[model samples]
Target chain A: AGRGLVFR
Target chain B: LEWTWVEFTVDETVDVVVCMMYSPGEFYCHFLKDDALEKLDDLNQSLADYCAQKPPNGFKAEIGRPCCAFFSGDGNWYRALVKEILPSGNVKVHFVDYGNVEEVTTDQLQAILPQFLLLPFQGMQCWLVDIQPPNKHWTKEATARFQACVVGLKLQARVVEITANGVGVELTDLSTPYPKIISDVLIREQLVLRCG
Candidate 1:
């Protein structure tokens, strides 16, 4: 899976 | 075995691209490009990916200690650089003899130096234009023996003109002669040497 953006 | 992540701060911020868990206790992480805390997905992946798909660390390893033309961003033209080491990350560390800067470069940004510039290393480098001939025909043992006998004492300097997947391009420069000759012509020239 691609890296998920947890926060802005 | 399982793994987890713990975040901590040390008065600094880090930019990470992606992390991979290869195997038990084997985790890999790619950092931000060019020491920036942002611009996480810069062209590093593209170059790295392009390298990964190629052999011998994207063919950069084969250029070790050889002269190659690598792109210099300052001039935006390929310049001469001697490949020093090929890094495990598919980056080649080259010493630009002319510009005097040691840089790590990607393979896509490098090209094989032309045969005209492929001469023996010297204190002052020189360049010239050369005509590359097609592959030489194979010679029989009798022909080889005859040619070897003809030029037994002829003094000449051997110069490498080019390196190719097929073979290396070389030339023989006879010290007494004004013009250089193709390496393959040595035998025929030997025959001429005996006659003329």
Candidate 2:
């Protein structure tokens, strides 16, 4: 829900 | 610090940075473009930076998982924003690696910085399209550019990216790392952009 969201 | 800093790595953030959006935003944003869910995530969550608050669920599932799905999600959100909320349609992806400055804006360079900063707090994906620009023309185009990049929204994305990029790429098991297949090719003269 924010910028910190990361995908491997 | 080397100005052109380019290499194999930086730091890990998927934990320190991107905490949860992955389980939600990834499988959806992945395999499509090695899609950086972070970029999409950054774009969606930061709508407020543009003086617009995301109105949808702010968190939606149900839609079939896919990479470019964000384009669909954004279209749905933008329609509501433009019609119901009357906000400007400032959401869409800019073509990758074009002129470097779409994000860099050596074209906009205050030469100091990047684009504007809308407020924030919601949404996800893709910063591509509108193919093309060179230094000579981007320098002249009235708005095909950045010097006009004189707003907080512009500044905000950079600030946010730093915080964002730091933890953007997630790796489930840092010990094992992710599996990647490299194409077999012979190396010739290398143009090293940055080095040790």
Candidate 3:
């Protein structure tokens, strides 16, 4: 539910 | 409800940590002074542009370290404080300006531009002085309900004490014509209990 993804 | 701070005052306007519903005593937020706010927005814009061109790297996480992390929630870069490091490249960060926290990967982290560190960190940790949830934690409904009650209202906080972690305060809702003690109202509703 955290709106995060690997930035690469 | 009313909340306030130091280098600020016992009573001042602040945006509550929207992320803190489940944690009742943690009434956290960055100090919001009127004049510097415009500068903060301008600096963040510069940061976004800088990060877009610079490519992130060189930020190794550590407890109590200040750095920059990309918030995918908005695809923007902001100042953050490293709170914890987890396995598989995961890291926990407290967004300095907003007081909300998120878990992010190290690759998403960046060393702040030296100039970016010019402004004092926007994040200031604080807590409600004397209230405890009836249960182990607060209900989403209770948090949401309190959030609404604080909308457009100024938080005036009276400093009760300061601990190594943060300031503790008795908060009040500075509603027009009638000011309300935030802790008392929540206690009255039986949503929380008086602790001190």
Candidate 4:
């Protein structure tokens, strides 16, 4: 899930 | 297996938007000239700096000489270096505006402690998610601050999604002059070697 953050 | 992530990028690779980049590559890139001329100009000029931001693209990075990314980012961020606007013939292509290229790049940098934050989150997940379970909890809390950061990033997504249709119109030869040059060459050869 792109729920939180990846590349933030 | 090149199975999992090979398709993580696809016909609609999460990033690619253009038709050419999507489907017609192996052959098109093969036909690509390894070397070609660039427009220097029909004028003499002092080569001045124009700091166009160049996007850091994955494909571009993969094909470039090793360490080029670090060098480019260093130059872009620190040296105040500018890439030439036109071909510095026998040189490289100009650095295109980063936003104009890979639009995702703008969001790639998180200056306010995100590197440390992201690192902590991943480290916990990788080496000790359950053992240092408290650490994971702290990491989750760190994520809470992103709630407002989330609001700010919404606008950037808007920019990334904006695309305009492009249509190219080429000027037809007044008399098919480009091919006429070759035709003239053949005719001249025939005339000069007549009777041969």
Candidate 5:
């Protein structure tokens, strides 16, 4: 939802 | 001291020394000076510089993992996040500090230092607070206006809101004589529609 929100 | 995300609080102000606005919605920034996120600009550069003479090499990549990769545009080594590994064995990566995504061949990638990953990521993705186009499509003028105001200027921004979509912020131009909120200029020009 923000920066560094990894794709899972 | 290195900066970390634990310090970015809502309602707190942060200096935006550099802005990388692909679009208003996809805006990313570097807190280059006098902010909690400040030192990272130097730190990232140091990492790139250190990797220059004896760059990290002879390593493989893991999907969704942090690695060191070369940016195709600048040919500089940066702390990168691995995205996908293609059948051809080339690697796709996101430049963590600068928010650039690209695919690079194996020779262009290297193993990132463990110490480098200890610090929080640098790219702070932000969106202008509650403003979008009525047509839900951003016109070139709107994007250009947004970039013109925010990209090269020194700004002090505060987080207005945070939600599932992204972090929302409003920025004020400190370099101008009169403080100006970036959104006000765009909305007044009718370049963008104010929405919640």
Candidate 6:
């Protein structure tokens, strides 16, 4: 897991 | 002839110039009249040394799917979160237990969430502790105070809107906007709390 993992 | 003279000098002078050009270390030593080259070499050495260090596989393999804490600059605190993915370079992609935001962090940027501060996953759960302590010791006194103040300032009911392996996402029921609400809000709200 790293950056840009979050989403809508 | 002038052209012959030029060619003669070119062959003779060019040999010295080419030798100087390819001489590598020794030739540069004199041309470098100051400590500038020393500084540059130090910087180069430092960079090379840094580049030589490899990522430990223990960190790369051990972290995924594990509960951890990450620094949220917006909140100035280490929030409960989990590693969703491990990158080839050994960094982790993580989502805070409560909100929808995901962040990529290095091993040093994350830590194990303390057991006492760990919360059970329960979406839509109520969490109303006024004098809540920092979930872990990673928080400074100022940050803890600021975080507690922000939660208290919500001045409304709150509920755990989301839950993940790391922590619960508590949403303010009465407030219209997101937690931390704005930049000027408490540090915890900046990082720890979320909106939507």
Q: For all the predictions, what are the DockQ values?
A: 0.02, 0.15, 0.08, 0.02, 0.05, 0.14
For B1-196, candidate 1 gives per-residue lDDT tens digits of 1111122222222222212222111112232324332222232233234323435232333444333334445433322344444333334433222223345555434443343132222111211113211234323442343234224333222222222211111223354556444333533444212111
Interface RMSD after interface superposition, each candidate: 15.5, 14.0, 10.6, 15.8, 9.1, 23.4
Candidate 2: docking tier: incorrect
In order, the Cα lDDT scores of the candidates are 0.30, 0.20, 0.65, 0.17, 0.73, 0.28
Model 4 stretches astray by more than 4 angstroms: A1-8, B1-36, B40-48, B52-104, B107-196
Worst 10 residues of 6 chain B by lDDT: B16-25
Task: For candidate 5, give the DockQ.
Answer: 0.05
| Candidate 3: residue B38 Cα off by (Å) | 2.3
TM-scores of all models?
0.23, 0.17, 0.76, 0.14, 0.82, 0.26
Q: Could you tell me the TM-score of chain B in model 5?
A: 0.84
- When summed lDDT is taken over every stretch of 10 residues in candidate 3 chain B, the lowest stretch is B1-10
- RMSD list, candidates in order: 24.1, 17.9, 6.2, 26.2, 5.6, 27.9
Q: Model 5: per-residue lDDT, tens digit, B43-116? A: 66877776776545677677777777877687677778788777666778977776778888988887777777
State which candidate has the highest lDDT: 5
How are the candidates ranked when ordered by TM-score, highest leading?
5, 3, 6, 1, 2, 4
Q: Considering the two chains of model 1, state its CAPRI-style docking category.
A: incorrect
True contacts kept of 6: 0.00
Where does candidate 1 stray beyond 4 Å? A1-8, B1-58, B79-83, B86-99, B118-196
Highest DockQ model number:
2
Off by over 4 Å in 2: A1-8, B1-10, B13-74, B78-192
Query: Candidate 3 — which residues are off by over 4 angstroms?
Result: A1-8, B1-22, B139-142
Q: What is the lDDT of residue B88 in candidate 6?
A: 51
Best candidate, TM-score: 5
Residue pairs clashing in model 5 are none
By DockQ rank, best first, the candidates go 2, 6, 3, 5, 4, 1
Report the CAPRI category for model 3: incorrect
